Amino acid sequence: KIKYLKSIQISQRSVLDLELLAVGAFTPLDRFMGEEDYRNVVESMRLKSGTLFPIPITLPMEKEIAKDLKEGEWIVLRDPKNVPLAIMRVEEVYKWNLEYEAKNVLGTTDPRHPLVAEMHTWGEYYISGELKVIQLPKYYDFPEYRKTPKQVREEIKSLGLDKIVAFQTRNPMHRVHEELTKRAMEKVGGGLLLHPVVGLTKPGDVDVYTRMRIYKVLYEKYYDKKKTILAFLPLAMRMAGPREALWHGIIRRNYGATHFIVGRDHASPGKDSKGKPFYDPYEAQELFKKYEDEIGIKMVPFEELVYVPELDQYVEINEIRENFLKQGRKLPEWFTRPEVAEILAETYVPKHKQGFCVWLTGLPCAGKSTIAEILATMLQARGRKVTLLDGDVVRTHLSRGLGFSKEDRITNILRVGFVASEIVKHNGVVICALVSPYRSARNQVRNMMEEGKFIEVFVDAPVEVCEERDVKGLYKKAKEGLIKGFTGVDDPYEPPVAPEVRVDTTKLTPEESALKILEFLKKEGFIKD
Amino acid sequence: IKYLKSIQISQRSVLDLELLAVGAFTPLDRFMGEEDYRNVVESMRLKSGTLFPIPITLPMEKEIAKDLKEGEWIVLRDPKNVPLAIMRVEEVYKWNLEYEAKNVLGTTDPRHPLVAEMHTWGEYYISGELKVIQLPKYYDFPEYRKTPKQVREEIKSLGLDKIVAFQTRNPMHRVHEELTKRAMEKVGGGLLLHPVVGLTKPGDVDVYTRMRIYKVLYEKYYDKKKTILAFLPLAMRMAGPREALWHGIIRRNYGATHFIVGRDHASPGKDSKGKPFYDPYEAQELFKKYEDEIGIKMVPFEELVYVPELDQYVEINEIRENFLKQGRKLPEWFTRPEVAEILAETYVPKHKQGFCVWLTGLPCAGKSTIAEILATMLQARGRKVTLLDGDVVRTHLSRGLGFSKEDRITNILRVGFVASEIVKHNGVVICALVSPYRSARNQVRNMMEEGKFIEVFVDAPVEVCEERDVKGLYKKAGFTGVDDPYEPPVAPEVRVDTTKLTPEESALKILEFLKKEGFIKD
Ligand SMILES: Nc1ncnc2c1ncn2[C@@H]1O[C@H](COP(=O)(O)OP(=O)(O)O)[C@@H](O)[C@H]1O
Ligand SMILES: Nc1ncnc2c1ncn2[C@@H]1O[C@H](COP(=O)(O)OP(=O)(O)O)[C@@H](O)[C@H]1O
Ligand SMILES: Nc1ncnc2c1ncn2[C@@H]1O[C@H](COP(=O)(O)OP(=O)(O)O)[C@@H](O)[C@H]1O
Ligand SMILES: Nc1ncnc2c1ncn2[C@@H]1O[C@H](COP(=O)(O)OP(=O)(O)O)[C@@H](O)[C@H]1O
């Protein structure tokens, strides 16, 4: 009977924290932290009780909603799509300090830290109270592998395993990670819990679907199923290095792990705005060993493993993939399993198989359509499917119902841009040939596509070239548009301030202009020919 | 030319005009007058007696033809309004489709691609003196687009006194390469590979893929001292035997001394009753009766079959398109590796092919919920998805459109247009609109290749909004199911009753169908 209750929509981070609270992943915790537990966790990595818990888990609340919360009231925690997940009694509402929390938990207040930057968007108050679960978030990707602590413990049981090593990861797994985990099994003498994070990791990680597919194919094809469990963890990482390493240990223990792998640079976001590493490479191993007994999970530590061609094996240092994922290509068998490399190659296609939008902007009769047509032909002759969005196509399929106000014309540009950006998403080539006079509208379209995939072409011509180029009477009226045709005046054309290609049409034939766009496309690697 | 009337001609007529202008149809130099036309139709001859087996005429819609003045000069412009020639209006006459189709083609069956196109031709033919302004200009492989003069010059530069020509409208596999190189050895001269890049047959491999195939195959496998590659901008008629003779005339005008005529030469296949339009060797027999008069020797081949136990093609002694649209990889005994990879570039495996899931049904039926779930399932399987749901469509696509029947149709056609372009690039697009009008959804289907539009009927009762609506429009009320009626699909690919299936189960059922067709290999 939640319909009478006040509702709040919570962040994607809070949905994940709520989910893990509800399934017992954070045991002993069963609710968001109140003020006393919070402040002791921040200062000492301990709940008020004295139980170790290194990472604060709180529910932020904007001060405009906090102001009207009432002690003892039940509220509905709803997800970003408004689905009700839990009700919460509001027992505590308290102010937190960003820099104190960041400094103590993360070791830094540098906003280059992904979590520091995020904390600036968090509501100014934290709230706490008893939770009643309505439902868990529902997933439609790989629900077979999304297992609760209870399901994983019951699976360890079924396989007859007494010892289990857990592997944390937020990254695709290569053959170094495969060796890492398998050495760890043999060493501890138990099975293995592959436990990748699918909730929130670090901005700019490989997308979750690609990663999940990687973990799935690698588990099913390369691991012994009597000794190995795969399970997806809906964790919202803090990227808090050593403190998060400890946290991982507690979580994996609640899933039934007796052992936990910690390698080099565990749970670290890298380096700060000074270039200084956020954590020492083995600071996490260090803290973990100090607490491993109290937590009740044994650390299986690794020094940085390296590949030795002479041995064709991965050894400890005592004895990256930046040319491949970019415009480059498939990783070799000794670095990555073929099935994983193939999945990566589907996601990260070479630059000459990537989509891009050639946007041709300029004055009426500048020659946009002619150049577009020619370039489309040249591109198709090179094996590329092309969508050509010129005046006629756009006015037929996209423009109907729009007027000729500035707004309607910006709408039209943005419409063409949305369509072009969806085609680029699917690795298609789009050529757009519109006057598109408004610079901001065009900038907006650039912002719809991945960086480098918007080729803005400035088709430069003199003012009122139409007649010179034998476009007169009603044909010129058609080119100029309604306002200009009837009044003799229009909004000024706003040229691309820094286009990819500039084409001076008084100097180049439309074929030469088209060839110029082509040479840019080869230069960037969009065409190998 | 600014004082003259202008008319836009068809793509077919642009190509006929190009070939008239470069002398490919010599002795013809204009579109046919009524006397020439009738004697060509009836007896494969110009009024003068000169052999010409295929009519070349210029169709004009009845309303324009009526306003033409005897003896006047007009400008002939292409579909993009570029002026190619002026023509004097010396004749304007009606033609008869049944007359022309039955005599020239042997049939009036609309299954014949030309018969079907002829029903779109203007009802009058025009003829008179031509003065060329400019030839069509191309920007694909201009180096291989060669006039009769140029091919005849290149023949001399190679010092070849005999040249066998090869007609094709298809990719060349090893069978064709062996067919051409054997023809060449029989004749003892050179080879002119003369593929058609103008108009062929609907459903043919697109011209760009084909040209790239001819170019790589010629560049890496043919002896340059005896092989010429030239692209022919012919608008084929698919007229079998009669077209064979025509090809002979044309290739002779390019300098060919010999012409390959294989099985079923220039045939479009079978009619509506599943019968071949022409007999397999009728073209070879007709050609043999006129070859001396034409002045080009036929090099006939019996049908070449591949015999695995020899690794050789033999003429029977002592199809493929159905696996291109499936993205199957061709074996090295059948195709050269470079051709196989060009075809694989354009014809991707089925599980990588683009498709459109179009969820139609009443408001609150659950189209958006189902589409969102399906999107996730598809993304998890490694397909990027464009989701054209209500909110995406309303923000980006349908602003400025209202709720009138016209605007609702316009909106269905617009989302359909967008989906079709995504599909063209092998993307997955899920659309979730009421889209109540059946004719409009059918128009959207026709924007895509057969098998690529998955129409899903999300079947819920009319009053399902009672328990499901949150926005409040059903309570407040052009509403579909209440004011303006919904037209359900006659044969959707998938149907989901939503009073029985959960949104997850509905999406799972769509997944199942996509797996069955092979669009999703999990
Ligand atoms: N080359 C390596 N040598 C040793 N340990 C490694 C190596 N690469 C990764 N690891 C360890 O394996 C796990 C994989 O973690 P990863 O997904 O890269 O980031 P995170 O530590 O943030 O989960 C971590 O415990 C890490 O310390
Ligand atoms: N650089 C140029 N020099 C001479 N004529 C040109 C040039 N560019 C275009 N034209 C001609 O001007 C006319 C208008 O060109 P078009 O491509 O339609 O311009 P837009 O699409 O910018 O309105 C066409 O007939 C075209 O052939
Ligand atoms: N297996 C085969 N055996 C003999 N001749 C063939 C075979 N396949 C194609 N041909 C011949 O090769 C030429 C090109 O065939 P095709 O590409 O269908 O073009 P068209 O439709 O113009 O005949 C034609 O002369 C045809 O008869
Ligand atoms: N069995 C069901 N099938 C589809 N939708 C359902 C079902 N049961 C409840 N609903 C709800 O109906 C509401 C409206 O659904 P929506 O997907 O927006 O419909 P549409 O997009 O067809 O207008 C949603 O909140 C959805 O969860």
Short mmCIF file of C-alpha atoms in Angstrom, two decimals, chain A residues 203-389:
data_model
loop_
_atom_site.label_atom_id
_atom_site.label_comp_id
_atom_site.label_asym_id
_atom_site.label_seq_id
_atom_site.Cartn_x
_atom_site.Cartn_y
_atom_site.Cartn_z
CA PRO A 203 34.00 6.02 -16.49
CA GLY A 204 35.31 4.87 -19.88
CA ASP A 205 35.50 1.14 -19.11
CA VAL A 206 34.54 -1.40 -21.77
CA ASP A 207 30.72 -1.45 -21.96
CA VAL A 208 29.03 -3.98 -19.68
CA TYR A 209 27.48 -6.07 -22.47
CA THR A 210 30.84 -6.66 -24.22
CA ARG A 211 32.40 -7.52 -20.85
CA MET A 212 29.59 -9.88 -19.82
CA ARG A 213 29.87 -11.68 -23.21
CA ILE A 214 33.62 -12.02 -22.65
CA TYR A 215 33.16 -13.54 -19.15
CA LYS A 216 30.42 -15.88 -20.42
CA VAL A 217 32.42 -17.22 -23.43
CA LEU A 218 35.63 -17.58 -21.41
CA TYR A 219 33.90 -19.47 -18.58
CA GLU A 220 31.92 -21.86 -20.83
CA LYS A 221 34.82 -22.67 -23.15
CA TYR A 222 38.00 -22.49 -21.06
CA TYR A 223 37.14 -23.32 -17.42
CA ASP A 224 36.53 -26.60 -15.58
CA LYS A 225 32.84 -26.47 -14.50
CA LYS A 226 33.31 -28.76 -11.50
CA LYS A 227 35.70 -26.27 -9.92
CA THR A 228 34.50 -22.94 -11.35
CA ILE A 229 31.53 -20.65 -10.68
CA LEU A 230 30.72 -17.57 -12.73
CA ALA A 231 28.56 -14.89 -11.08
CA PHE A 232 27.91 -11.19 -11.97
CA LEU A 233 28.22 -8.67 -9.12
CA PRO A 234 25.92 -5.58 -9.31
CA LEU A 235 28.46 -3.54 -7.32
CA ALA A 236 28.81 0.19 -7.65
CA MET A 237 32.55 0.50 -7.27
CA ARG A 238 34.05 3.38 -5.35
CA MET A 239 37.52 2.94 -6.96
CA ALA A 240 38.91 3.38 -3.43
CA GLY A 241 42.05 1.18 -3.78
CA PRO A 242 43.01 -0.41 -0.39
CA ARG A 243 39.71 0.41 1.41
CA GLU A 244 37.76 -1.05 -1.51
CA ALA A 245 40.06 -4.12 -1.56
CA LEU A 246 39.00 -4.84 2.06
CA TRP A 247 35.38 -4.16 1.09
CA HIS A 248 35.67 -6.67 -1.78
CA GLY A 249 36.90 -9.25 0.74
CA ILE A 250 33.86 -8.83 2.96
CA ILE A 251 31.49 -8.97 -0.02
CA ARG A 252 33.08 -12.09 -1.53
CA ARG A 253 33.01 -13.76 1.91
CA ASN A 254 29.22 -13.16 2.09
CA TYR A 255 29.02 -14.97 -1.27
CA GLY A 256 30.86 -17.94 0.33
CA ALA A 257 34.45 -17.28 -0.74
CA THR A 258 37.21 -18.47 1.60
CA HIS A 259 39.91 -16.80 -0.53
CA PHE A 260 40.16 -13.56 -2.48
CA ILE A 261 42.59 -12.61 -5.25
CA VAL A 262 44.36 -9.26 -4.95
CA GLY A 263 46.87 -8.30 -7.61
CA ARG A 264 48.67 -5.13 -8.64
CA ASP A 265 46.80 -1.77 -8.37
CA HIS A 266 43.60 -3.37 -7.01
CA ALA A 267 40.43 -1.17 -7.29
CA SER A 268 42.50 1.87 -8.31
CA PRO A 269 41.39 4.64 -10.74
CA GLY A 270 44.98 5.52 -11.71
CA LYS A 271 46.61 8.94 -11.29
CA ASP A 272 45.53 12.41 -10.09
CA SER A 273 45.62 15.84 -11.76
CA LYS A 274 49.31 16.04 -10.70
CA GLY A 275 50.10 12.70 -12.37
CA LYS A 276 50.53 11.08 -8.94
CA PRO A 277 49.18 7.51 -8.54
CA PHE A 278 46.17 7.54 -6.20
CA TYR A 279 47.47 4.50 -4.32
CA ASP A 280 50.76 2.59 -4.06
CA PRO A 281 50.66 -0.53 -6.30
CA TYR A 282 50.62 -2.95 -3.32
CA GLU A 283 49.06 -0.72 -0.62
CA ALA A 284 45.86 -2.80 -1.03
CA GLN A 285 47.62 -6.16 -0.50
CA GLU A 286 49.26 -4.56 2.54
CA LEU A 287 46.04 -3.36 4.22
CA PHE A 288 44.28 -6.64 3.30
CA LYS A 289 46.87 -8.91 4.97
CA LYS A 290 46.62 -6.78 8.14
CA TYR A 291 42.84 -7.44 8.25
CA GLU A 292 42.46 -10.82 6.48
CA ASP A 293 41.93 -12.79 9.76
CA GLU A 294 39.35 -10.31 11.17
CA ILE A 295 37.35 -10.49 7.91
CA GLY A 296 37.65 -14.29 7.63
CA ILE A 297 38.85 -14.39 4.03
CA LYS A 298 42.38 -15.32 2.96
CA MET A 299 44.25 -13.16 0.44
CA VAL A 300 45.86 -14.86 -2.58
CA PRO A 301 48.29 -12.09 -3.55
CA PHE A 302 50.01 -11.67 -6.92
CA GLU A 303 52.82 -9.46 -8.06
CA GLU A 304 52.41 -8.09 -11.60
CA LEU A 305 52.46 -11.05 -14.03
CA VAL A 306 54.24 -10.57 -17.36
CA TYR A 307 54.45 -12.55 -20.62
CA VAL A 308 57.76 -14.20 -21.50
CA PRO A 309 57.96 -15.29 -25.21
CA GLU A 310 60.90 -17.61 -24.44
CA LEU A 311 58.66 -19.56 -22.03
CA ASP A 312 55.26 -18.82 -23.67
CA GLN A 313 53.89 -18.47 -20.13
CA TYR A 314 52.89 -15.74 -17.70
CA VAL A 315 55.33 -15.39 -14.81
CA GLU A 316 55.68 -13.03 -11.81
CA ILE A 317 57.74 -9.88 -12.54
CA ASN A 318 60.64 -11.38 -10.52
CA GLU A 319 62.15 -13.60 -13.24
CA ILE A 320 49.01 -1.63 -22.72
CA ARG A 321 46.50 -2.69 -25.41
CA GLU A 322 46.54 0.78 -27.00
CA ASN A 323 47.75 -0.24 -30.48
CA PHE A 324 45.02 -2.88 -30.74
CA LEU A 325 41.69 -1.46 -29.46
CA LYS A 326 41.99 1.88 -31.33
CA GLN A 327 42.07 2.15 -35.16
CA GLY A 328 44.16 -1.04 -34.78
CA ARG A 329 43.07 -4.67 -34.74
CA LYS A 330 42.86 -8.18 -33.28
CA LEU A 331 44.93 -9.31 -30.32
CA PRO A 332 47.21 -12.35 -30.73
CA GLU A 333 46.39 -15.84 -29.41
CA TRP A 334 49.11 -15.66 -26.70
CA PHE A 335 47.58 -12.42 -25.27
CA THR A 336 43.86 -13.09 -25.69
CA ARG A 337 41.64 -16.10 -26.42
CA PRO A 338 40.26 -15.90 -30.00
CA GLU A 339 36.60 -15.75 -28.86
CA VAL A 340 37.37 -12.75 -26.64
CA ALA A 341 39.43 -10.97 -29.32
CA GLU A 342 36.50 -11.52 -31.74
CA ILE A 343 34.04 -9.97 -29.24
CA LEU A 344 36.41 -7.02 -28.78
CA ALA A 345 36.74 -6.66 -32.57
CA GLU A 346 32.94 -6.46 -32.96
CA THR A 347 32.83 -3.68 -30.35
CA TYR A 348 36.00 -1.87 -31.35
CA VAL A 349 35.98 -2.03 -35.14
CA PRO A 350 38.90 -0.69 -37.24
CA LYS A 351 38.58 2.98 -38.22
CA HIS A 352 38.04 2.12 -41.90
CA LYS A 353 34.96 0.13 -40.86
CA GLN A 354 33.64 2.79 -38.45
CA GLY A 355 30.61 4.98 -39.16
CA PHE A 356 30.94 8.71 -39.75
CA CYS A 357 28.78 11.68 -40.71
CA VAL A 358 29.87 13.99 -43.51
CA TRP A 359 27.86 17.15 -42.85
CA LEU A 360 27.99 19.64 -45.72
CA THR A 361 27.03 23.16 -44.72
CA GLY A 362 27.02 26.34 -46.81
CA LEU A 363 25.04 28.97 -48.70
CA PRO A 364 22.29 28.07 -51.20
CA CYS A 365 23.89 27.02 -54.53
CA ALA A 366 27.33 26.67 -52.78
CA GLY A 367 27.32 23.19 -54.30
CA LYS A 368 26.45 20.94 -51.32
CA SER A 369 24.16 18.52 -53.23
CA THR A 370 26.55 18.11 -56.15
CA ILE A 371 29.51 17.42 -53.87
CA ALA A 372 27.38 15.06 -51.69
CA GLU A 373 26.28 13.06 -54.70
CA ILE A 374 29.85 12.71 -55.97
CA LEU A 375 31.31 11.78 -52.57
CA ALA A 376 28.50 9.24 -52.02
CA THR A 377 29.50 7.62 -55.31
CA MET A 378 33.19 7.57 -54.36
CA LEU A 379 32.40 6.08 -50.96
CA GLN A 380 30.12 3.40 -52.44
CA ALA A 381 32.77 2.50 -55.04
CA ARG A 382 34.99 1.80 -51.99
CA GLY A 383 32.48 -0.68 -50.52
CA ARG A 384 30.58 1.61 -48.15
CA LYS A 385 26.82 1.73 -47.81
CA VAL A 386 25.76 5.40 -47.69
CA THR A 387 22.64 7.19 -46.45
CA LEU A 388 22.36 10.51 -48.29
CA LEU A 389 20.25 13.07 -46.43
#
